[PDB]
């Protein structure tokens, strides 16, 4: 009997399964029965990340109305549109449309979408689930696929295999290996990069000095598990929030190179579907860059693309500030940085000190010197109160927060520019990977306003201290010493060091047995751009055929999602409804390429 496999049953593998079911009526000759083998060690639909068993203190950073696993009439794909409830719609009042659902609520949704997909499967499709890890993929002698499972079963005679493996484990770095040995030598707790939901924090005693290294979204997970996750609660009084300790909290210290928590997402004022539509980095501009890349002279991010992005962000900021319909047409007609930008801003009455400054935005303390921890704390509380305030204004009327949400709304235009060798190698390395991606994340992939407010209250209550910029950490006899060179008197010896970040996809250092087998036998390879290696797994153009060390696109092997980071930009994001989501059209294209290779 005809047979294919999907490796991974998270949102992406679940979506491949739903799109297979959708197009199998059209693409399988009548009377043909296809078995789809779905393989995941975690219960299928949510997979590992979204599993319903995890702690309820952990949130999504997407509002509930903007999360789906269903196609809609806006999705440009060849498969049939099969409409279904968004997270919000399904949750039946459990969560508001502009509120952040718990990860377990998204799990309960994903669980239901898996079960529904099975119930609605056409007669031509039989689904077989496997509570196992796939560990080897090989060509059989005839060119069909053998997939070996860790439970001793082997799947043979496979027409196609889809790898939707998502957030894979990575070998500990050199730094993380030293810091873990140090914990072993002096009985300390080292927690290496991980989903915060996957870590055991119960070994951290009340009052323990802990360093959270990292101030992004992993940091806010840990912040919550070590406070509200231990009996802590908040109380709102005359608008302002207050933390009510349980007495079980550690003494939490945090820091990073930048020294700042990620910016609050402006409160959504764009409803479920609305966004800033591109007016500088436009489809027309993106076609011009694709053409230059295909004819072998790819653009430079910093010289060619950044100026278009900065112009959009600055334009939306000043449009929200001036609120005059004549303004934006005149500001858009000017090249980025032209002397007339200033003259026009002056004409519409914008003081030289409300002007935009990428230096203030990324390094808002940089004018300022800190005599001790207390000056740093007073400045930081000022900063976080101003961030919360700005986010309350929302992503339409709030000048700053609408401007920064542009960075979110340009993701698809930027994907189309940089993806599949769209940049010179040296630019991808020095401009995108090592500057823009992290800045972007700081500015536009931060937490809900609520979490900034909470952190503000936790600083006031003394439960959490943020150390300061350029976090230094040293192994010392019996502890780690953490300080900020920019904040005298911030030295503190901790006995728990938590790396508050996810492992970044790295094929080179993968801990997944299956990808390691494929790498070592030359059946996949790191995606390389002009001599820069990304450790994404290399794939072809949609529908993303796996590429081997010889440069051959495998007709029977597809890869889709986080492991392809480098080929694709910001793969760690879900599907949005009503905005021609590329996750859903990618899934449709993969499903039809699989059905086609099976029905010859
Ligand atoms: C902590 C965290 C929070 C996030 N929050 C958000 C958010 O709020 N909003 C958002 O849009 N995105 C969020 N994301 C991004 C996330 O990448 C996507 O939402 C989505 O989970 C990606 O789907 P996926 O199937 O590609 O990957 P995953 O969700 O990682 O699924 C991969 C699945 O494949 C399985 N698998 C891997 N290797 C094998 C193997 N060899 N054999 C069998 N099974 C295997 C795993 O067990 C897992 O179930 C978050 C990610 C993380 C880690
Ligand atoms: N709330 C949620 O839904 C949630 C939770 C977790 C993760 N996620 C998803 O996963 C992605 C990654 O999250 P993340 O927290 O790992 O990344 P992140 O949000 O970018 O936070 C990473 C932090 O680590 C710091 N950092 C990293 N390596 C460091 C080092 N060696 N030394 C010092 N500081 C270091 C970075 O700051 P500096 O660069 O300034 O040092 C930054 O402050 C998100 O973008 C999102 O898609 C979502």
Author numbering: 2 to 601
Quote the passages of the study that discuss this structure, keeping the authors' original sentences:
FzmM and CreE catalyze the triple N-hydroxylation of L-aspartate to nitrosuccinate. The crystal structure of Streptomyces sp. V2 L-aspartate N-hydroxylase outlines a characteristic helical domain wedged between two dinucleotide-binding domains. Together with NADPH and FAD, a cluster of conserved arginine residues forms the catalytic core at the domain interface. The Lineweaver-Burk plot of the initial rates revealed a pattern of lines intercepting on the horizontal axis, suggestive of a ternary complex mechanism. Thus, Streptomyces sp. V2 L-aspartate N-hydroxylase operates as a typical class B flavoenzyme monooxygenase: it is a single-component enzyme that binds simultaneously FAD and NADPH and retains the pyridine nucleotide coenzyme throughout the catalytic process.
The enzyme was originally crystallized in conditions where the sole precipitant in the reservoir solution was ammonium sulfate. Expectedly, the protein structure is populated with sulfate ions. Two of these sulfates were found juxtaposed to the FAD and embedded by an arginine-rich site, establishing H-bond interactions with Arg266, Arg409, Arg412, Asn413, and Arg416. Notably, these residues belong to the helical substrate-binding domain. Being negatively charged molecules, we speculated that these ions occupy the putative position of the substrate and therefore inhibit the protein. Consistently, we found that the enzyme loses 50% of its activity already at 5 mM SO42- and becomes completely inhibited at 10 mM concentration. Interestingly, this effect is specific for sulfate because chloride (up to 100 mM) and phosphate (up to 50 mM) salts did not affect the enzyme. This finding highlighted the bound sulfate ions as likely substrate mimics and the associated Arg cluster as the putative site for L-aspartate binding. The crystal structure of the enzyme with NADP+ was hence solved at 2.5 Å resolution. The active site is in a cleft at the interface of the three domains and both FAD and NADP+ are clearly defined by the electron density. We noticed a difference in the conformation of this side chain between the sulfate and L-aspartate bound structures. Its side chain is oriented “inwards” in the sulfate complex to partially occupy the catalytic site.
